[PDB]
Motif scaffolding. Structure first.
Motif, PDB file in Angstrom:
ATOM      1  N   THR A 178     -19.917 -27.599  64.899  1.00 49.03           N
ATOM      2  CA  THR A 178     -20.174 -28.263  63.630  1.00 49.03           C
ATOM      3  C   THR A 178     -21.673 -28.422  63.437  1.00 49.03           C
ATOM      4  O   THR A 178     -22.368 -28.908  64.336  1.00 49.03           O
ATOM      5  N   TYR A 179     -22.166 -28.018  62.268  1.00 52.38           N
ATOM      6  CA  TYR A 179     -23.570 -28.163  61.909  1.00 52.38           C
ATOM      7  C   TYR A 179     -23.678 -29.091  60.706  1.00 52.38           C
ATOM      8  O   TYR A 179     -23.096 -28.814  59.650  1.00 52.38           O
ATOM      9  N   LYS A 180     -24.411 -30.189  60.871  1.00 53.98           N
ATOM     10  CA  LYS A 180     -24.697 -31.120  59.782  1.00 53.98           C
ATOM     11  C   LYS A 180     -25.978 -30.664  59.092  1.00 53.98           C
ATOM     12  O   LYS A 180     -27.069 -30.768  59.664  1.00 53.98           O
ATOM     13  N   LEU A 181     -25.844 -30.149  57.873  1.00 54.93           N
ATOM     14  CA  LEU A 181     -26.963 -29.629  57.097  1.00 54.93           C
ATOM     15  C   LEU A 181     -27.278 -30.594  55.960  1.00 54.93           C
ATOM     16  O   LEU A 181     -26.372 -31.028  55.241  1.00 54.93           O
ATOM     17  N   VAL A 182     -28.556 -30.926  55.798  1.00 56.64           N
ATOM     18  CA  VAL A 182     -28.995 -31.904  54.808  1.00 56.64           C
ATOM     19  C   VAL A 182     -29.933 -31.218  53.828  1.00 56.64           C
ATOM     20  O   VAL A 182     -30.910 -30.579  54.236  1.00 56.64           O
ATOM     21  N   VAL A 183     -29.636 -31.359  52.540  1.00 59.12           N
ATOM     22  CA  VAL A 183     -30.420 -30.754  51.470  1.00 59.12           C
ATOM     23  C   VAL A 183     -31.304 -31.832  50.858  1.00 59.12           C
ATOM     24  O   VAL A 183     -30.801 -32.814  50.297  1.00 59.12           O
ATOM     25  N   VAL A 184     -32.623 -31.653  50.964  1.00 59.60           N
ATOM     26  CA  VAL A 184     -33.589 -32.619  50.456  1.00 59.60           C
ATOM     27  C   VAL A 184     -34.531 -31.930  49.475  1.00 59.60           C
ATOM     28  O   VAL A 184     -34.662 -30.703  49.446  1.00 59.60           O
ATOM     29  N   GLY A 185     -35.195 -32.743  48.672  1.00 52.48           N
ATOM     30  CA  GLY A 185     -36.109 -32.241  47.664  1.00 52.48           C
ATOM     31  C   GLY A 185     -36.200 -33.199  46.497  1.00 52.48           C
ATOM     32  O   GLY A 185     -35.368 -34.087  46.318  1.00 52.48           O
ATOM     33  N   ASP A 186     -37.244 -32.998  45.693  1.00 61.42           N
ATOM     34  CA  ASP A 186     -37.470 -33.822  44.513  1.00 61.42           C
ATOM     35  C   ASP A 186     -36.288 -33.742  43.548  1.00 61.42           C
ATOM     36  O   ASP A 186     -35.461 -32.829  43.604  1.00 61.42           O
ATOM     37  N   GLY A 187     -36.223 -34.717  42.646  1.00 58.42           N
ATOM     38  CA  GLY A 187     -35.194 -34.697  41.625  1.00 58.42           C
ATOM     39  C   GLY A 187     -35.345 -33.489  40.717  1.00 58.42           C
ATOM     40  O   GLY A 187     -36.453 -33.093  40.351  1.00 58.42           O
TER      41      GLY A 187
ATOM     42  N   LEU B 176     -32.608 -28.195  54.584  1.00 60.44           N
ATOM     43  CA  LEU B 176     -33.191 -27.347  53.550  1.00 60.44           C
ATOM     44  C   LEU B 176     -34.147 -28.200  52.725  1.00 60.44           C
ATOM     45  O   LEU B 176     -33.726 -29.194  52.121  1.00 60.44           O
ATOM     46  N   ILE B 177     -35.424 -27.825  52.715  1.00 60.34           N
ATOM     47  CA  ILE B 177     -36.423 -28.469  51.865  1.00 60.34           C
ATOM     48  C   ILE B 177     -36.537 -27.645  50.590  1.00 60.34           C
ATOM     49  O   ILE B 177     -37.118 -26.556  50.596  1.00 60.34           O
ATOM     50  N   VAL B 178     -36.006 -28.172  49.492  1.00 61.91           N
ATOM     51  CA  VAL B 178     -35.905 -27.443  48.236  1.00 61.91           C
ATOM     52  C   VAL B 178     -36.996 -27.922  47.292  1.00 61.91           C
ATOM     53  O   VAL B 178     -37.196 -29.132  47.120  1.00 61.91           O
ATOM     54  N   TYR B 179     -37.701 -26.979  46.676  1.00 64.99           N
ATOM     55  CA  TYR B 179     -38.533 -27.279  45.523  1.00 64.99           C
ATOM     56  C   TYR B 179     -38.188 -26.299  44.413  1.00 64.99           C
ATOM     57  O   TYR B 179     -37.466 -25.318  44.618  1.00 64.99           O
ATOM     58  N   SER B 180     -38.693 -26.595  43.223  1.00 68.05           N
ATOM     59  CA  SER B 180     -38.509 -25.745  42.057  1.00 68.05           C
ATOM     60  C   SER B 180     -39.808 -25.006  41.777  1.00 68.05           C
ATOM     61  O   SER B 180     -40.876 -25.625  41.708  1.00 68.05           O
ATOM     62  N   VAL B 181     -39.717 -23.682  41.619  1.00 72.15           N
ATOM     63  CA  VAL B 181     -40.906 -22.887  41.334  1.00 72.15           C
ATOM     64  C   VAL B 181     -41.489 -23.175  39.959  1.00 72.15           C
ATOM     65  O   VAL B 181     -42.583 -22.692  39.647  1.00 72.15           O
ATOM     66  N   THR B 182     -40.789 -23.948  39.130  1.00 73.32           N
ATOM     67  CA  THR B 182     -41.304 -24.399  37.844  1.00 73.32           C
ATOM     68  C   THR B 182     -41.850 -25.817  37.898  1.00 73.32           C
ATOM     69  O   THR B 182     -42.328 -26.321  36.876  1.00 73.32           O
ATOM     70  N   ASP B 183     -41.786 -26.470  39.055  1.00 74.98           N
ATOM     71  CA  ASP B 183     -42.213 -27.857  39.212  1.00 74.98           C
ATOM     72  C   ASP B 183     -43.298 -27.903  40.280  1.00 74.98           C
ATOM     73  O   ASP B 183     -43.006 -27.775  41.474  1.00 74.98           O
ATOM     74  N   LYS B 184     -44.550 -28.084  39.845  1.00 74.00           N
ATOM     75  CA  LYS B 184     -45.660 -28.182  40.788  1.00 74.00           C
ATOM     76  C   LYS B 184     -45.519 -29.404  41.687  1.00 74.00           C
ATOM     77  O   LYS B 184     -45.735 -29.314  42.902  1.00 74.00           O
ATOM     78  N   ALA B 185     -45.167 -30.554  41.109  1.00 72.59           N
ATOM     79  CA  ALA B 185     -45.059 -31.777  41.897  1.00 72.59           C
ATOM     80  C   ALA B 185     -44.007 -31.640  42.991  1.00 72.59           C
ATOM     81  O   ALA B 185     -44.204 -32.118  44.114  1.00 72.59           O
ATOM     82  N   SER B 186     -42.884 -30.986  42.685  1.00 72.00           N
ATOM     83  CA  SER B 186     -41.854 -30.792  43.701  1.00 72.00           C
ATOM     84  C   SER B 186     -42.350 -29.904  44.835  1.00 72.00           C
ATOM     85  O   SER B 186     -41.929 -30.073  45.984  1.00 72.00           O
ATOM     86  N   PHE B 187     -43.249 -28.963  44.532  1.00 71.54           N
ATOM     87  CA  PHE B 187     -43.842 -28.126  45.571  1.00 71.54           C
ATOM     88  C   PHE B 187     -44.826 -28.921  46.422  1.00 71.54           C
ATOM     89  O   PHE B 187     -44.845 -28.785  47.649  1.00 71.54           O
ATOM     90  N   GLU B 188     -45.643 -29.764  45.789  1.00 70.82           N
ATOM     91  CA  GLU B 188     -46.581 -30.583  46.547  1.00 70.82           C
ATOM     92  C   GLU B 188     -45.859 -31.570  47.454  1.00 70.82           C
ATOM     93  O   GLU B 188     -46.354 -31.885  48.542  1.00 70.82           O
ATOM     94  N   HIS B 189     -44.689 -32.051  47.039  1.00 72.80           N
ATOM     95  CA  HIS B 189     -43.946 -33.020  47.831  1.00 72.80           C
ATOM     96  C   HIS B 189     -43.271 -32.402  49.048  1.00 72.80           C
ATOM     97  O   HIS B 189     -42.637 -33.135  49.817  1.00 72.80           O
ATOM     98  N   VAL B 190     -43.393 -31.085  49.246  1.00 74.07           N
ATOM     99  CA  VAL B 190     -42.858 -30.455  50.452  1.00 74.07           C
ATOM    100  C   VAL B 190     -43.517 -31.038  51.696  1.00 74.07           C
ATOM    101  O   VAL B 190     -42.856 -31.265  52.715  1.00 74.07           O
TER     102      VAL B 190
END
Ligand SMILES: Nc1nc2c(ncn2[C@@H]2O[C@H](COP(=O)(O)OP(=O)(O)NP(=O)(O)O)[C@@H](O)[C@H]2O)c(=O)[nH]1
Ligand SMILES: [Mg+2]
Ligand SMILES: [Zn+2]
Ligand SMILES: [Zn+2]
Length: 164
Positions: A4-13, A75-89
């Protein structure tokens, strides 16, 4: 039972955490508070995936640190259309490493929404530099139909955990 692998998806709204999770589990894209369970066979080895789709809000420190402690990979997710979400990585990577009290931990940087090429603000080269800086793999995804690398993102994360 099966590993069993517990995978957590995180990232900006708004970066597409839920859309990626729903695409991965139900093969749908429609623009459930429990974590999602499934069987899957990765490199001819069956496993159970337990995937937590987190909320992009500030949330609570106690609840946030708790599900980070139990995660086998992130998984650290950002949006390629959201600069702030990329900086929050940088913030997500540091925060998870702090909770784990580790210098490295199985994680993959996910650049989502690459189908919105005319709104894209983070280049592929910027994404790869960010992943290289944090010493984690890089993958570009799209949760919109036809989906791009959605299965690969989750499967590659399990592969990192296995090769840890
Ligand atoms: N074009 C496109 N739109 C996407 C993609 N992924 C998500 N979206 C859209 O972007 C919006 C936000 O997606 P959502 O899955 O709610 O993101 P989230 O990261 O779960 N947001 P929250 O942190 O608030 O739960 C939705 O309108 C969704 O349909 C993608 O790859 N491409
Ligand atoms: Mg969501
Ligand atoms: Zn064009
Ligand atoms: Zn880092």
């Amino acid at each position: 039972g099966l590993p069993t692998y517990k995978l957590v998806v995180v990232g900006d709204g708004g970066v597409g955490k839920s859309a990626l999770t729903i695409q991965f589990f139900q093969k749908i894209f429609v623009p459930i508070e429990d974590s999602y369970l499934k069987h899957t066979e990765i490199d001819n080895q069956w496993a159970i995936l337990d995937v937590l789709d987190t909320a992009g809000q500030e949330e609570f420190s106690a609840m946030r640190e708790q599900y980070m402690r139990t995660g086998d990979g992130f998984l650290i997710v950002y949006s390629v259309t959201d600069k702030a979400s990329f900086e929050h990585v940088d913030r997500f990577h540091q925060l998870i490493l702090r909770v784990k009290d580790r210098e490295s931990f199985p994680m993959i940087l996910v650049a989502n929404k690459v189908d919105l090429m005319h709104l894209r603000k983070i280049t592929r080269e910027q994404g790869k530099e960010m992943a290289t800086k944090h010493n984690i793999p890089y993958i570009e995804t799209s949760a919109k139909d036809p989906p791009l690398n959605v299965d690969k993102a989750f499967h590659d994360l399990v592969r990192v955990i296995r090769q840890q």
